[PDB]
């Protein structure tokens, strides 16, 4: 995983949000979190091959802090529909 992505993961706040792993400007995975910190840190110790892939293929990680879990739910759904990320279940 790119050092800058590890750094961003370790700096992520204990706040609700949506996260987007990207490669060459294209989202490859979009997820939500009740706490960005907790969820993103799970990528550092990959529990599945897909999680390993997402973290190795990405060249960028974007995070969006949201108002609350309801916003996270709908923002995530909308972004997945918009971008159809390669690692999103279809
Ligand atoms: Mn999700
Ligand atoms: Mn960007
Ligand atoms: Mn709420």
């Amino acid at each position: 995983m790119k050092e800058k992505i590890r750094k961003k993961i370790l700096l992520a706040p204990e706040e609700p949000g949506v996260y987007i792993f990207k490669n060459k400007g294209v989202p490859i995975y979009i997820g939500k979190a009740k706490r960005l910190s907790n969820r993103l840190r799970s990528y550092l110790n990959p529990q599945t091959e897909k999680v390993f892939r997402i973290g190795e293929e990405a060249d960028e990680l974007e995070t969006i802090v949201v108002m609350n879990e309801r916003e996270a739910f709908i923002l995530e759904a909308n972004l997945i529909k918009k971008y159809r990320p390669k690692y999103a279940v279809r």
Side-chain angles (χ1 to χ4, degrees):
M1 168 183 281
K2 292 199 156 205
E3 180 50 62
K4 60 184 203 182
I5 296 175
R6 180 176 292 270
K7 182 181 188 182
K8 179 139 183 96
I9 287 178
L10 292 170
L11 285 169
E14 300 182 327
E15 298 287 347
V18 171
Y19 64 90
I20 308 154
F21 286 96
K22 304 177 60 164
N23 190 34
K24 301 160 180 188
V26 181
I28 66 171
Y29 188 75
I30 300 180
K32 63 178 175 66
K34 291 183 210 310
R35 303 176 155 235
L36 285 163
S37 51
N38 295 341
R39 178 58 175 183
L40 287 173
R41 281 175 185 250
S42 78
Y43 287 82
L44 302 179
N45 294 304
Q47 291 296 341
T48 66
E49 296 276 2
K50 184 173 172 174
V51 173
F52 179 67
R53 296 180 178 108
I54 292 159
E56 293 307 297
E57 183 177 344
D59 67 9
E60 179 184 4
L61 169 65
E62 173 175 359
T63 59
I64 300 165
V65 173
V66 300
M67 292 186 289
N68 58 48
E69 291 180 19
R70 296 181 78 242
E71 194 180 9
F73 186 90
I74 185 163
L75 181 56
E76 187 210 24
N78 282 352
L79 292 179
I80 289 171
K81 282 183 246 286
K82 181 179 173 173
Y83 291 112
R84 297 304 185 184
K86 87 180 259 191
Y87 290 111
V89 302
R90 298 217 183 178

